[PDB]
Each structure stands twice: as structure tokens, then as C-alpha cells.
Amino acid sequence: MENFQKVEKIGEGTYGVVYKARNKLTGEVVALKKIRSTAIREISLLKELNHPNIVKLLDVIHTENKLYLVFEFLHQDLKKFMDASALTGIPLPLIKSYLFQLLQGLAFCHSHRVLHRDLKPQNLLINTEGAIKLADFGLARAFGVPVRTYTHEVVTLWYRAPEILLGCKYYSTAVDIWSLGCIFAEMVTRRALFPGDSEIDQLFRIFRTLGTPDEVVWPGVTSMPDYKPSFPKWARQDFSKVVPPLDEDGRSLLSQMLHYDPNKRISAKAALAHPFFQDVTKPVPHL
Ligand SMILES: CN(C)C[C@@H](O)COc1ccc(Nc2nccc(Nc3cc(Cl)ccc3Cl)n2)cc1
């Protein structure tokens, strides 16, 4: 915080404000997150979790009852890009490139047993080169995911996996695959897949599209903490209706990313080998 000159406020994260700043000694431009022992060790360990598709955590500065996290700076988030592309839509080749890169980032972190747990358009960052990176990876394990952010904003439930909503205490890396699948669908259709406004609304929106889960598709689901036998029983919808005009390879992949059973849900590694990526390229984004 000493060798940092604030340039401007970038926005507000889940835990603290984020500024674009310059290292007063190295001139390095960074994203500085300001948050007002176990958490410190946990976060400090993230400095070694480096990958091209993960926003680099340069440093962790604990001083004066404040925690500063210094990140590599990216010029924009995916949310802004999706909104700017609302009328025309993000070209499929670019959507495929982004999904491909995000899966590489997940595969890396998951190989080290680190999960994100709260993936959303606001923490997926992009540059003018065509790269996309995941930000805030690992912070959920250290701080937890609150109901409201430090500014009292509601933490979105739109990308939350069903096992979390049903009360599972030990989530797995599968929770991130679910979130990414929801984001994938959103990029394709230009509308959130499951825009719930409460935990039950979120759960029922999922149920209405994918069908109410039962022991057939998800062994043990009826014994989960928040599962209720009184849940309405909705029939599953054809994905052809859920994400048109995505082709069959894309629908196949999305379906596997949205499997109810965390055990059946495709892994990031397996997803990277899916036929959908056979013709993947790296386009330069227009905006
Ligand atoms: C209302 N409006 C100003 C909000 C958006 O446009 C905000 O646009 C931007 C513009 C640039 C960057 N770069 C960036 N680079 C590195 C880390 C990082 N972390 C981060 C930052 C915020 Cl703010 C929220 C959540 C996270 Cl995980 N952000 C991020 C968002």
C-alpha cells in the first residue's frame, strides 16, 4: 500500500474495493484489492498457483487491520463484454475460445485441489489479445462466500451448483464446472440460464429446465439436508430449446457440464478433450 499510487476505482468485489494502481517502485500497473491467520496462510499459498488463464496474485499485504491483494491487471470483465454484445452476440468461435481457456484454468486449479466456488461474469477477465482469465480463485475457501458483499450487494445465486443449494457441506471441483456451464449458456443465448432471486427460486428454475432430480439421476439426492419431498416434479426440457442455435457438440458438452450428480458431471480435463473443441481457435475480440 506504500509503493502503490491509486489511478482510479475499478469497482467493488465480494470482499473489498478494487483500484487500478501503479507500483511506485517498479512502475508496474496492477489491480489492488483492499479488504477491511488461517485465511492469510491460505491466500498466501495462492501466490504459487500460476497459470496463463488465472489472474496472477502478485502479492498479499497484511497491514493495519487491512488485507491488500495485488493482482495482475486486466482491462475488462466478461460481464461488460456480454452487455456490449447484447444486440449482436459474441461470435461462436470466440465463445468456444473463452470456454476452452476457462476450462484450462479450472483444470489447473483443480489439479492442485483448489476450487473457485463463485464463478460469474464479474470475475472472468479479458484482454484485447483474446485471452480470458479467472479471478478470485481460492478466496472462497479462505473467506467463505457471503450472502451479501462488503457493500451489501446480493451475491448472485445464478451460477450456484445444485448440491450447494441442497445443503451439501463438502462440495467438489464439480461446482465450478456447473458455474462455467451456466456462463457458457449465457454467452450463447445472451440471457442468464437460471436467473434465480432466492435459493428456492434458483433451485426451481434449475428443476423446471433440467427436471426435478430424483434417485434415478442423482443417487442420494433425497437425503440431502435441504431436499424436500414436497418439491414440485417438473419434466426435463430438450436442450435444443435451452440453448439454440448451439450445435450438437456444444449441447452435448453443456449437458454433461450440467449433470445433477457431481460424480457424473464432466471434469475440466475431460471437457477439454470433448469434440466441441476440435476446431477451437483464438480470435481477437472486437471490444
Ligand atoms: C460499474 N462498473 C464500473 C463495474 C465494471 O465495469 C468493472 O470493470 C472492470 C475493469 C477492469 C478489471 N480488472 C481486474 N484485473 C485484475 C483483477 C480484477 N478483480 C476484480 C475487480 C472488480 Cl471491480 C470486481 C471483481 C474482481 Cl475479481 N479486476 C475488472 C473489472
Side-chain angles (χ1 to χ4, degrees), residues 3-36 38-63 65-86 88-168 170-285:
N3 305 66
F4 287 110
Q5 179 180 181
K6 294 182 178 180
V7 174
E8 53 176 48
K9 173 183 175 176
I10 286 302
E12 315 175 304
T14 306
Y15 312 106
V17 63
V18 185
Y19 307 107
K20 176 180 186 178
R22 186 168 289 99
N23 187 305
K24 289 182 178 180
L25 180 61
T26 60
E28 172 174 45
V29 172
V30 306
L32 181 64
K33 169 168 288 181
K34 177 182 177 182
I35 308 173
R36 300 177 193 290
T38 174
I40 295 300
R41 183 209 281 208
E42 191 57 42
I43 301 303
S44 295
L45 294 175
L46 300 178
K47 290 183 295 180
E48 303 185 310
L49 189 68
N50 302 148
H51 185 276
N53 300 113
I54 296 298
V55 176
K56 186 179 180 61
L57 176 62
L58 307 178
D59 275 292
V60 180
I61 301 174
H62 182 194
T63 54
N65 299 300
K66 293 180 180 179
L67 181 56
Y68 291 96
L69 304 184
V70 187
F71 297 103
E72 119 184 55
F73 176 80
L74 279 112
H75 298 69
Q76 159 185 163
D77 67 358
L78 181 63
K79 180 58 176 175
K80 181 181 179 180
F81 183 47
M82 301 180 314
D83 290 337
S85 304
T88 56
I90 302 178
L92 173 62
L94 183 55
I95 292 176
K96 181 174 294 181
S97 175
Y98 283 168
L99 183 63
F100 186 62
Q101 294 178 65
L102 295 174
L103 283 169
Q104 286 177 243
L106 289 192
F108 172 75
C109 296
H110 294 173
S111 69
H112 291 82
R113 289 304 92 195
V114 177
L115 59 71
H116 189 296
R117 231 237 67 173
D118 190 33
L119 290 170
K120 46 195 164 191
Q122 290 80 1
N123 53 39
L124 295 188
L125 312 174
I126 63 174
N127 60 31
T128 57
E129 292 277 30
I132 187 164
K133 309 188 186 193
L134 302 123
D136 281 1
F137 223 108
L139 298 189
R141 186 108 294 146
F143 302 128
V145 178
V147 178
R148 307 303 188 70
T149 74
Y150 80 105
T151 62
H152 305 295
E153 183 167 305
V154 177
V155 169
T156 190
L157 304 171
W158 299 3
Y159 313 98
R160 184 168 296 182
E163 60 266 36
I164 303 180
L165 292 161
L166 288 174
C168 181
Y170 309 110
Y171 0 89
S172 74
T173 51
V175 300
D176 292 331
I177 287 296
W178 176 280
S179 304
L180 185 52
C182 292
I183 294 172
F184 174 30
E186 191 171 337
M187 287 194 279
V188 170
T189 64
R190 319 223 281 279
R191 175 162 292 184
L193 182 57
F194 305 127
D197 61 356
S198 72
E199 288 191 49
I200 197 64
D201 186 63
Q202 188 63 41
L203 198 60
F204 286 2
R205 279 175 175 278
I206 293 174
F207 291 2
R208 288 202 287 285
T209 295
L210 302 178
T212 301
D214 55 26
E215 291 295 322
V216 174
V217 67
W218 192 356
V221 70
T222 63
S223 296
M224 306 196 70
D226 303 315
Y227 174 84
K228 302 301 196 311
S230 57
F231 283 166
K233 296 186 173 60
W234 285 287
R236 183 187 181 80
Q237 303 290 303
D238 310 328
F239 270 47
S240 61
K241 170 188 166 188
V242 179
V243 290
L246 193 58
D247 60 71
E248 176 53 36
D249 280 323
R251 300 189 303 244
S252 166
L253 176 58
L254 180 64
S255 63
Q256 298 175 61
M257 290 177 85
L258 297 183
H259 271 154
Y260 272 116
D261 193 340
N263 263 298
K264 306 196 222 306
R265 204 171 303 152
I266 192 171
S267 70
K269 286 181 62 63
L272 288 175
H274 191 287
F276 183 62
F277 300 113
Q278 182 247 5
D279 65 345
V280 68
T281 62
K282 184 178 177 57
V284 170

